[PDB]
Amino acid sequence: NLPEHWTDMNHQLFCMVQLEPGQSEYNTIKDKFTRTCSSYAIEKIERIQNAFLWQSYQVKKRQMDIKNDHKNNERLLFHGTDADSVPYVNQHGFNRSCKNAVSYGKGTYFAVDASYSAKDTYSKPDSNGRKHMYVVRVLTGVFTKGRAGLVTPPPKNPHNPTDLFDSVTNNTRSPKLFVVFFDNQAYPEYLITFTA
Amino acid sequence: NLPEHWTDMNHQLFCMVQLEPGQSEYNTIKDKFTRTCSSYAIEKIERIQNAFLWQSYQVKKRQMDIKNDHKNNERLLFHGTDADSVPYVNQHGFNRSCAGKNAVSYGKGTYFAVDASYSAKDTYSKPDSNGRKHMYVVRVLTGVFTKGRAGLVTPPPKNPHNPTDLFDSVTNNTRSPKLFVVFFDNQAYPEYLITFTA
Numbered sequence A: 001n002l003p004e005h006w007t008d009m010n011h012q013l014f015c016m017v018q019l020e021p022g023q024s025e026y027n028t029i030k031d032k033f034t035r036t037c038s039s040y041a042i043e044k045i046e047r048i049q050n051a052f053l054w055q056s057y058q059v060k061k062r063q064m065d066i067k068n069d070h071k072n073n074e075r076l077l078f079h080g081t082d083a084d085s086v087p088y089v090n091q092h093g094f095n096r097s098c099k100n101a102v103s104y105g106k107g108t109y110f111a112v113d114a115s116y117s118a119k120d121t122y123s124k125p126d127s128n129g130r131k132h133m134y135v136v137r138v139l140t141g142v143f144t145k146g147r148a149g150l151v152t153p154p155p156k157n158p159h160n161p162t163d164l165f166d167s168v169t170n171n172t173r174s175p176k177l178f179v180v181f182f183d184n185q186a187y188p189e190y191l192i193t194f195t196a
Numbered sequence B: 001n002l003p004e005h006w007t008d009m010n011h012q013l014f015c016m017v018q019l020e021p022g023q024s025e026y027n028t029i030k031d032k033f034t035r036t037c038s039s040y041a042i043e044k045i046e047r048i049q050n051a052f053l054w055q056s057y058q059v060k061k062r063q064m065d066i067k068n069d070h071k072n073n074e075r076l077l078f079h080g081t082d083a084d085s086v087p088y089v090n091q092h093g094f095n096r097s098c099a100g101k102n103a104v105s106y107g108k109g110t111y112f113a114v115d116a117s118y119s120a121k122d123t124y125s126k127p128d129s130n131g132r133k134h135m136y137v138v139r140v141l142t143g144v145f146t147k148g149r150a151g152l153v154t155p156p157p158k159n160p161h162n163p164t165d166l167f168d169s170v171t172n173n174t175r176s177p178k179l180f181v182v183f184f185d186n187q188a189y190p191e192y193l194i195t196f197t198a
């Protein structure tokens, strides 16, 4: 059940599609980035068409929508990474088992603001100065404040220790980062290649 | 997509079903266990009906069946664990972030045994305060595998010049596999829980 806005993949299951500047999709993704990264220079934006990752993510989404008994489980967030990680993420998504602060738990970190992900410690500039940031669909669901050393989100009620929050954050009232602890809770939707 | 022989769970997402000795389903698991653990005695065997784990696992199996073309991607393996872990595994399956270092490490992942005798070691199926040991029987997507290495946090690439095209799992020995390590969520479905004693 591959999304309408995807382009034909000639019966293949993985493709990176460079977006056309000035069309609705490119402008929408560029605006989300330029909200906080207007001083940067965008070289290109690519749509990640990964059928397998999409399938696994949509299954997790449908499960979270049932468990939480609403939609609103999804947020669009940013993730800066190094050039050498880009092929892995494009193909396999985010892996908590793969450096950098993990103060809110041993998961994959997503930023609310592109400017946070634009830090060199996250979107490490490559031998030619290029920086890489994903726009990510994240199943944040019902979240709570994180803490160091978590390997999963805490339980909602320690009377039912296996009924977990879906994600953790730095701050529940005004979140700036989210951490997820399971594969296929995050779909890398766009890759932005940019410079300082 | 839930299997038709599962008990009706009446819109519930999770059920443990106690099997009856003399049913083929119970006896095949008992035989698989006693092949290497005839010194121990089974208290009971429960079928794990976890709708969400099943759905996510079956999606990964379909994907690996498509990717590998005409491989037997799935093996039925054993996993010994402590009583404190059983509620989490039942509900959430096998989490590599919780895995112990194995006495012979072939990678940082979840370990599964070919032989119930291996999983029956107290180091894995730690006896609880009542002397009960717990072992899962697990559908594992072993796929195409290679000998692992202690440093691994994912299976290695098949080809060093294409680092993202991975083996599905690793083993101790490709000619005589006795253990498999998996590195991703939803690559293993806990199908039965064996409760057993000395």
Ligand SMILES: O=C1N=NC(=O)c2cc(OCc3ccccc3F)ccc21
Pocket: A078, A079, A080, A081, A100, A101, A102, A103, A104, A109, A110, A111, A116, A117, A118, A122, A123, A177
């Ligand atoms: O874009 C990112 N890419 N990879 C990251 O690891 C990452 C981590 C991240 O917050 C880490 C963090 C910040 C402040 C305090 C404690 C923390 F743990 C935010 C964005 C990113």
